[PDB]
């Protein structure tokens, strides 16, 4: 893994340059606006468990064939494992938001996950539907436009932060595809 600070090192090591100027310009903003990123990851970790539960129930109330016998969500072990998997993906995308960088999201979960789900016979499009539901819940929690749930923040706009997790969830949804 690399955070945003490490990544301007390893892209300017590869150039043999000194870090400074325009790439230190973006490190300046991290040490500026990290309070917004902190309210962001707090708005994820205080809501995470309801997020994966609502996501898998939305997937099941869209497609009942997984809960039918012969489905992948049928029985005691499989649906608990699916809850576990969705929460793990949620945990990694929350880290990738907190780092401002998607390297560990590749290296620790997205590396070789699609072939694993093919080898287990896991249907892909249902999990794509699930992570899109998590993406909608994440941007709803980040715009503070949760119709059911309220936290108080210092006033201001967090559009860039909201945009960042959409790129990350699309990275997950494309890497599983």
């Amino acid at each position: 893994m690399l955070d945003a600070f490490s990544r301007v090192v390893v892209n300017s090591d590869a150039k043999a340059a000194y870090v400074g100027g325009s790439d230190l310009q973006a490190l300046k903003s991290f040490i500026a606006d990290g309070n917004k990123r902190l309210d962001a990851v707090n708005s994820i970790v205080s809501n995470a468990s309801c997020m994966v539960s609502d996501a898998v129930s939305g997937m099941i109330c869209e497609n009942p064939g997984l809960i039918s016998p012969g489905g992948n969500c049928y029985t005691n072990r499989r649906m608990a494992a699916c809850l576990r998997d969705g929460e793990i993906i949620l945990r990694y995308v929350s880290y990738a938001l907190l780092a401002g960088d998607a390297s560990v999201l590749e290296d620790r979960c997205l590396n070789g996950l699609k072939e694993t789900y093919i080898a287990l016979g896991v249907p892909t499009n249902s999990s794509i539907r699930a992570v899109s539901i998590m993406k909608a819940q994440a941007v709803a929690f980040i715009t503070n436009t949760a119709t059911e749930r309220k936290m108080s923040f210092a006033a201001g706009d967090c559009t860039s932060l909201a945009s960042e997790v959409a790129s990350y969830f699309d990275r997950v949804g494309a890497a599983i595809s």
Partner: protein
């Protein structure tokens, strides 16, 4: 002669696991822009 090693009373499992699973918190973290020479 008549070496009974293991479970000789049956043939053995078909030996197939041709998939890679994402290592969580256990991927061996190596250094960037370099090669681990020796150790």
């Amino acid at each position: 002669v008549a070496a009974k090693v293991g479970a000789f009373w049956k043939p053995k499992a078909p030996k197939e696991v041709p998939y890679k699973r994402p290592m969580g918190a256990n991927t061996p973290e190596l250094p960037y822009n370099t090669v681990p020479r020796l150790v």
